[PDB]
Amino acid sequence: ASVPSWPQILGRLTDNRDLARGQAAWAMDQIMTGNARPAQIAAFAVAMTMKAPTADEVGELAGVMLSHAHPLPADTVPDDAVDVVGTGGDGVNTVNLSTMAAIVVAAAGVPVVKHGNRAASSLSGGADTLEALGVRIDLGPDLVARSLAEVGIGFCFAPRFHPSYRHAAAVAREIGVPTVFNLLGPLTNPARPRAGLIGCAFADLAEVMAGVFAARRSSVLVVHGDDGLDELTTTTTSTIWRVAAGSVDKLTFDPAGFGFARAQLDQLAGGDAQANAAAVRAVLGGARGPVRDAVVLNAAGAIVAHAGLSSRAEWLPAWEEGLRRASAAIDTGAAEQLLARWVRFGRQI
Template sequence: VCKHGNRSASSKCGTADVLEALGARIELTPEQVVRCVNVAGFGFIFAQKFHPAFRHVGPVRRELGVPTIFNLLGPMANPAPVAYMLVGVANPARMGTMAAALAQRTTASLVVHGHGGLDELSLAGANRVIATRNGVVQAESTVNASDVGVTSADNGSLRGGDPAHNAQVVRDVLANRLAGPIRDVVVLNAAVALHLAGAAVSLRAGATLADSAISSGAGYAALEAFVAESQRD
């Protein structure tokens, strides 16, 4: 996995903020990102490091406090040659545009709009999805919690907090210390990603793999490996 992300601009907490709270160094060179992927199976590309202009846009985005075109540009500007992409959009009107763009640069992708307006798959109801494969944009469909065998829950049960709080939640989920909706939504999103990338033959199989990675400690080990590798010079 090679995640392209930034600090929070239109929300309370961004990917970069959480990773820093977990102890990771985020301003990595291309070589260091590749090393993290090879060692830990995960790398983080800090948008401001690879696209310096993003640094100047950030303050304006924070002042506006609402999603902007940069919420769409971020995922599409990932400099890594990723073959598969799972991208969430908060505005369903942008799904087709995003899917058409991703179809031109990926082997397969999935654009999702979560039930209740989330930019990720939700446990609360039907999630709208548009898949692309080999340059072809497919018809819109839906994915539900029941499709992967987890329990439905309202979006309020998934509300996060500041970077420190969210980092602790990440640790608790991956260390198999947290059950319930938060773990279930991780399994749901991971299951869809695994199926998209061809690592699982079905959504249910993807959920089994994701759940096993948590239960066995493999997920937490990957997190620790990433944090340690990111700190190396």
């Protein structure tokens, strides 16, 4: 078990056994060093999924991946930097909402460092919508570092930071269905921010994700809409896994308690890049309604997660602080301004 091989690992997996410590790691390190055949890649990716990954296993996959990633330059990522992202819906996305909450959070003064890919890739999306807004998404360590210090936000394009993952990515594309690899995006942010709002379509995988962040002592809300959204929803309650101090705390959450009127799922989903970018422009310019509401809400969440790093402040007041700051970042036009600053940045860069 501690002297690993592909047949040993896949066989343990096809036998529906949890992997021994280090096996997932060695599996990933092979795939990352060019020493795995496409069939071994696919077979590992698929079996890992069906067996039901563990926090340990996923943790090992994400760690190995980070060990090969390009870092950001030393001391350029603030210690309180946050991520805002969903691992993607069934065939759906909410990158409209997560893009808008990313921007709202940054404008409120919290450093946001994102990580993603263009659509229909196992590393999370978001790249295309940002490109449709005019954001230069493909920047090296140094300029992402500069973007984050100059604008208050940066985006780590996965192709650029995880080149050694190309083989896994191409295989993820051909399999053309979500695997355990689809979990990796929020756990493989190269800037390694210690906090975030992390949205997930699947409750079981969400709790495995909560577990991975807990081992890292991150302050994160892993959020699943009980309507299935990979975000805090306003159509109904959400489940939150509150990661903090190295433990997970599963909560039911309801935005009505904060004055959010109920909405209908299909008002929220989002669409392709151009569609998302029009709604970003619309909402950041003051368009009221349920999309805005969900953005303010998920931006609050990220802000609460931020609160959890250097504080053990109360749940309810941290949320009230979250909603006010997020609301004000939109209504003052600071979020709209931040996007135009973000767009100018790429063109001066």
